Amino acid sequence: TGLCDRFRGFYPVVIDVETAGFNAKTDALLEIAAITLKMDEQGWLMPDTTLHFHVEPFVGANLQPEALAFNGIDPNDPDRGAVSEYEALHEIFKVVRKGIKASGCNRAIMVAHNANFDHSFMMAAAERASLKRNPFHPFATFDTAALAGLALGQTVLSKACQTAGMDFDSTQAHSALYDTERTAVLFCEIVNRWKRLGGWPLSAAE
DNA sequence: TTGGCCCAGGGCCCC
Ligand SMILES: [Mg+2]
Ligand SMILES: [Mg+2]
Secondary structure: OOHHHHOOOEEEEEEEEEEOOOOOOOEOEEEEEEEEEEEOOOOOEEEEEEEEEEEOOOOOOEOOHHHHHHHOOOOOOOOOOOEOHHHHHHHHHHHHHHHHHHHOOOEEEEEEOOHHHHHHHHHHHHHHOOOOOOOEEEEEEEEHHHHHHHHHOOOOHHHHHHHOOOOOOOOOOOOHHHHHHHHHHHHHHHHHHHHHOOOOOOOOOO
């Protein structure tokens, strides 16, 4: 009933990014939050550690106005508190490598909504900053849109949360911290409901 | 417990 036995040794980490566009290679990463997970004694999954950073646009990054219109971020504001892609990701990777070790996992896997998006941005930022020993799987993800489709019959984040019996706020939507937390709680509830229904462990049904 | 965008009104929701 250990975390390391749940996902074949993958350590699931919830990620949401806010960006200045849809292209991971050309558009600025502006914000990232990460939430690691843990299992209790009863084997229920739940949020553990929470990290959140404002990110300084990389050298030569594009900034799409419509993106900034959508997320309401201003990369010029000297008050936002931005750090380098190197800084935010170094911190995230350190906390993650520590969680992998403590739980006896061997690799992290990104949990995110329409996960290829956040995965592509984090990987692009890691490559730019030349971070070595990136603990995240280089192509596998746990997409909560697909998981919600299965569990809840909904793929839109806000709707999936509401369908799962969670609160989800519009006026708080479109900020990394809130997004990541709701996503983490959605993922945990999906995993936990599968367990409550006797789908896990694989021996439980019989 | 989406308001606003994008291809008048409908449907979309990873920025
Ligand atoms: Mg968001
Ligand atoms: Mg997102």
